[PDB]
Subunit: 137 residues, 6 copies
């Protein structure tokens, strides 16, 4: 498991595009679990619907991708490029107050290429899912 300053020692992403607050579980070459707290203190809600705050779907995918990034990196001067997303589905809205849980499993690993099954939850409710393809450089 891994806190945000540690994440930041691994991923190059910084505010305002760092979308993982904490990694709770990490099994090398296998699976990673982490989350992002969602709050109206978040600048996105200013414009992702005045009077109706909804966490943008595409940012959930980015959060998944970033969590997968750390899993990749743990399995460190080089880069993790996500070149593909497939079968992405959004289920329910994510709102201020939700803890957005990310789950990322390795489906395939071949030299420098990684394929993940990713899912996002809020209170055990699936909200998003997708298969992400990554490359390392």
């Amino acid at each position: 498991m891994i806190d945000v300053m540690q994440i930041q020692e691994i991923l190059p992403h910084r505010y305002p595009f760092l979308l993982v607050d904490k990694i709770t579980e990490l099994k090398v070459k296998e699976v990673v679990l982490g989350y992002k707290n969602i709050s109206i203190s978040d600048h996105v809600f200013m414009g992702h619907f005045p009077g109706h705050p909804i966490y943008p779907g595409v940012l959930i995918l980015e959060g998944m991708a970033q969590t997968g990034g750390v899993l990749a990196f743990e399995s460190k001067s080089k880069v993790v490029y996500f070149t593909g997303i497939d079968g992405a589905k959004f289920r329910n809205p994510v709102r201020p107050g939700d803890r957005l849980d990310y789950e990322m499993s390795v489906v395939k690993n071949r030299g420098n290429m990684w394929i993940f099954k990713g899912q996002a939850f809020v209170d055990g409710n699936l909200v998003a899912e997708a298969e992400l393809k990554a490359m390392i450089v």
Copy 2:
């Protein structure tokens, strides 16, 4: 189970100074429970310590205050204002960090006409992180 759209119907506070994400429990004239999610997506961490994100204690107080605002407002048999004129015995126990759910508890210790006194506490996973008594008014 009272969300931000509805909190903003009650408080005039807006982003970037709305410090309550949800109110979970509200017993009129008595107690209010609510919380804020703490995330690195919060601009305060940009400056409240590069390479060392810590939620500023003073904002915990303000969140407490805002929660108490809601209780105050939702307890008048509309348009008045809730002015917090005092804070006492404020104590900061442990750091609040990105990833924490910051839980507020505000109980009314005294109420007389338009004056309210609150016992306030903030928690993360059942761990006291802040406390204070808050004095409020009405217009």
Copy 3:
């Protein structure tokens, strides 16, 4: 066709998550062309790589999506319906998009069935494909 103030009349999106600056072409029920100007004035580059500004791929998807929104809202038989994108498929990122780039969106309708829309989307910079995806949307009241 449509400038930013007009898009804002159709789309509910506002800054900081309005990712279309202009719609240049719009043929109802068929195809929409629009773009976003990419500049270091953009807050994303603060954190999407200090000393290495790269436009986040996921945001290119959302710009495609917002363009397609406009097309949909212009494409049935009133207003306040909402257009929810429920799926994205075969999304591919080709080349980095950088400050200075005009990011060109193209969205064509591949299927339309009552309240369901399916788009082929592509984004370009000087005629170079940078991203593509199939977007599924549901338009509901």
Copy 4:
């Protein structure tokens, strides 16, 4: 008698949570005077009241605290941290508005090894706007 950059040369606080613009007077182990310019160019007013800009009281406290931080750090003779662990008898008098120069005054009432107790006051044109007793720790 010090300016913003020198201040950053001392506190680790940065924008958008650096609430002191300038320190006007500094007597070691004794008292510190500094101020913050208040302007609608400040992000806080966007949300601390659409159509009614009021500088949040708690930010006045933090500005006092930061000023006291400098005084604490200046009584050295490097790298330690200044933790404010308590605030008491904090009272807010008048609203602080865009256009105000917010004057901080911080005196040491007690000093005990690594613990400091300050009387803090904030002014706008010589009008008391806030006050409190601030308790500070100071560790490696």
Copy 5:
């Protein structure tokens, strides 16, 4: 004698491009005095020189312009029109403006002809000229 809330009843400008905090004096068709508080709370310092906060000269010109806007709007007998600044001449920048400074604007009418206004503008800190320019405007 006019503050921010009132300023905004007149100017359409909003944060983060509202560069007047207060108007201290206004004599119709003649002169306007107002100012902006400069503080590191201001986002411009983030990038107008990390480790060296300098208030951009062009923003001083804009603040002058905005203050003249108020004077123009106030001196007029319809109601809602717009004040378009079409020109700036002999603009000179003298001294740096830094966090902590009160930036004083002064705008005098040198010419007025129907819907055209020409202003002599000056900006000060502590009575030191920091910028000046002649600004031409048109009401629409």
Copy 6:
């Protein structure tokens, strides 16, 4: 020819006050061409007119100035600063709006030791939208 991280090695300006995205042509001691992409992603539109995004004229001047900065820095062999002390005959023609590419053009009309005079013009699809004469000096 000069990309945005090249600009930043040269200019000290950073976001949110770096107003050049690219330099397309640079002839030493003669002329520089570069541009800025204008988008509603830009925070200025938040406040430079709710419901009516218009790129502030004074910021066009600053973009011109920054572009001329690079030219100057590229045309003499160390580190020093480029201070713009004057702007003259500045004229604003048409509004600049989200979606426009804002084209800068800076020619040297005079050069004497440490002093530069530029003729500057800004274009959007070949239409002049602003122009001015910029005076600059180079210091420690």
